[PDB]
């Protein structure tokens, strides 16, 4: 089979990449290792920037988020005895963000795919990349147990953190930067009534906790754990009384808890590779950078990746200037190292490190005083939480 | 002898403290180690923000400083190629800082309050303090080879960091938070033009460089060095050479050089110490806090303690509310962290750490990039730089 653009990866990434690209012409098909079923059992995300709600709408699959999304104006951090929110409306001026589960928008997406008749390999095993440098590149990958091969023009890497793409650039060719922390977050998703109309980050000097929700009536909540805990070692009843001891008294006690639909332990990385691309093989999403979840903004700069991968296919296809795609990663990292940062501070002041001295912890308490009480202060971080302009 | 308030040290604290309460009517003696000239030799500190410049005219000594002191209205901070200015008179609201050197402020402290003829003790060693809890306190000391005894209400140390006054208060009563950076700064002062008409705090690989000044002909530079170098391994010559390196191009070729008048290493740390009072004993200035001279806040936290300790024991004196001492620690200790924070940050994103990795490079360069180019980024510099309010 011949096609346009070669997609690896069915995430967000790639789907959102793949209706970008049919809707303008441009053919393209994906190959998925496994299975929708499989892709639709992630939770992970939930918090959406207002620059991907608008790409949601252009790639014409917004109906459902219009209607069951949630529009925050403001968010909270709790600290020390104290409650502060930001009002992130008034203090980006105007913008806002939008809680609808990385789940939906992927049903959405792949209900969109599904009926526009576009191509999509799933259970496509062993891809492997081929000629990246020639004018005809190529993937072949096993099907039951056949060996195909797919001739396209150029790939788009969007098969995540172990994806293939990566693997197949040189390493002398990529220059990677990198940070592990020392814990992760156990998330634990439920049926029951969100405790706050807006979400609520707080620090606790037994570790940080999240109250988020995905609709009036489930909630999604977090609680910074070590690396060498084990899922199962966290019964329901254990979370709900650890996260209780991490809360101020008056949300605890308005907490309306039940059983788990979902558990589980995601760690936490810092990673960014340069460039993004090789030869006719461009990175997108966590093929190319992985951020801490405490700034929501690994979904968010999957999106904005294939936003400017999107746009500058489309005139190298429609208006010939195939000279633009060069230019792909520097306008990607300049987004993306301002939003490793971001992600960054979040969580050095949201969370409790290991062996920190007296000196630090004084430190990371007045981080959270001065930037909660200036104006200026609540301005950084309103801007960059509703999300820096797309540029 | 007989006082009311007994100030160890005629530093700038000190004087300070001495000439603005010696105007209110409450006496004080101050006790000096050294002899004027000693004093009268440090370089040390050349900005002052907006609330010590008020102060220095409440104590009626600032003639001199409203004819040489010189206003500036934005500092410029040069990084990887960029040179970049922050607007500090509308980036705060109209506010400004002034530059007049330490040794300038302390000679004319020293000149108002020998012709105000209130006492003071040059020379006076092995300084003692005893009965810090009793309503009736006193400090010894040896002027010649005599023990003499003063007696006093309160004692206010404002001997620096290796004062005596810190030393008094049991160990088990105070708590104490440090950091000591793992570099120094080398100053030299010149008789020359300065290269600029504002501040330059410049980031380069070398290490951090500063270019200040005192006068329109009276320069001060500074240059980020290891903590084993020694001031006699580096000549004039190399000094102009190495600060030339760090240096915008454009800005190096406009620099005059010349001969040194002083030169120095000094060393950067952060300390605090909680609380700062020991019943009848206040610390102010140094002896109780240091904080790294990047964000220049040591003087001005002098000034500040300073401010805060004259207007209780006014109150305490002529109102008759000693109740009111009790909170000395509370109040400046607020003002103090957000100083800490602000020095922390500041020595963070300027200067060259070794052991760095490649992620932490990426980062304090975007921190630059953020800072420097977002409206509520250039405004928490500005607000923090010139000073934040007295409470
Ligand atoms: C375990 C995990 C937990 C996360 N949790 C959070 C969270 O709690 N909150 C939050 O804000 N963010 C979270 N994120 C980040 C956010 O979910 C991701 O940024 C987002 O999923 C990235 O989109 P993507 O399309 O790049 O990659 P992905 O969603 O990973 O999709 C990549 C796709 O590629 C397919 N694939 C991989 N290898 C191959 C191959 N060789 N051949 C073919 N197909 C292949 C994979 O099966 C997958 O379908 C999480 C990410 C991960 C991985
Ligand atoms: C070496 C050094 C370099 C500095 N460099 C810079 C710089 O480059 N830029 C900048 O912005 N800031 C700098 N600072 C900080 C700034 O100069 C200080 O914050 C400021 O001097 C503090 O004022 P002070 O009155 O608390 O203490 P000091 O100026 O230290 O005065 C304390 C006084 O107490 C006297 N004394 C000490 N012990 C006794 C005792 N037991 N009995 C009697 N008298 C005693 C001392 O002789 C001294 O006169 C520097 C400080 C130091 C110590
Ligand atoms: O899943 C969420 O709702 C969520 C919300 C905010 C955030 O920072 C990270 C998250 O995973
Ligand atoms: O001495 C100066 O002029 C000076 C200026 C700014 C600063 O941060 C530190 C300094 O010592």
Redesign the interface.
């Given at each position: 089979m011949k096609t346009q653009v070669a997609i690896i990866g069915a995430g967000p990434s790639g789907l959102l990449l793949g209706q970008l690209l049919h809707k303008a012409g441009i053919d393209n098909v994906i190959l998925e290792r496994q299975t929708p079923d499989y892709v639709l059992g992630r939770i992970r995300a939930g918090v959406l920037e207002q620059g991907m709600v608008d790409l949601l709408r252009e790639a014409g699959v917004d109906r459902r988020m219009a209607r069951d999304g949630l529009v925050h104006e403001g968010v909270e951090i709790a600290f020390a005895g104290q409650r502060r929110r930001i009002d992130l409306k008034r203090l980006s001026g105007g913008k806002t963000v939008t809680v609808y589960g990385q789940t939906e928008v992927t049903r959405d997406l792949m209900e969109a795919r599904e009926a526009s008749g576009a191509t999509t390999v799933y259970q496509a095993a062993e891809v492997r990349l081929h000629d990246l440098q020639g004018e005809r590149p190529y993937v072949t990958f096993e099907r039951d147990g056949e060996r195909l091969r797919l001739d396209c023009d150029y790939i788009a890497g969007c098969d995540g953190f172990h994806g293939i793409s990566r693997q197949s650039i040189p390493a002398e060719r990529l220059?990677?930067?990198?940070?592990v922390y020392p814990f992760g977050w156990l998330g634990l998703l439920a049926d029951t009534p969100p405790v706050s109309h807006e979400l609520i980050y707080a620090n606790h000097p037994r570790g940080f906790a999240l109250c988020s929700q995905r609709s009036a009536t489930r909630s999604r909540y977090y609680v910074q754990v070590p690396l060498t805990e084990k899922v199962e070692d966290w019964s329901d009843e254990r979370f709900w009384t650890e996260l209780k001891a991490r809360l101020p008294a008056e949300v605890a006690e308005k907490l309306v808890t039940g059983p788990s639909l979902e558990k589980s332990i995601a760690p936490l990385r810092?990673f960014?590779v340069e460039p993004m691309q090789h030869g006719r093989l461009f990175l997108a999403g966590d093929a190319a950078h992985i951020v801490p979840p405490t700034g929501a903004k690994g979904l968010n700069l999957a999106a904005s990746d294939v936003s400017t991968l999107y746009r500058l296919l489309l005139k190298a296809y429609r208006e010939g200037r195939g000279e633009l795609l060069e230019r792909y990663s520097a306008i990607c990292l300049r987004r993306i190292?301002?939003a490793?940062?971001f992600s960054?501070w979040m969580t050095s002041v949201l969370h409790r490190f290991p062996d920190t001295?007296?000196?630090?912890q004084?430190?990371q308490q007045?981080?959270l005083?001065?930037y909660l009480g200036?104006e200026?202060?609540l301005?950084?971080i309103?801007?960059n939480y509703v999300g820096l302009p797309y540029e």
């Open positions: 220059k990677v930067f990198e940070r810092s960014v190292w301002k490793e940062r960054w001295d007296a000196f630090s004084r430190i007045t981080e005083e001065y200036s200026a202060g301005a950084t309103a801007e």
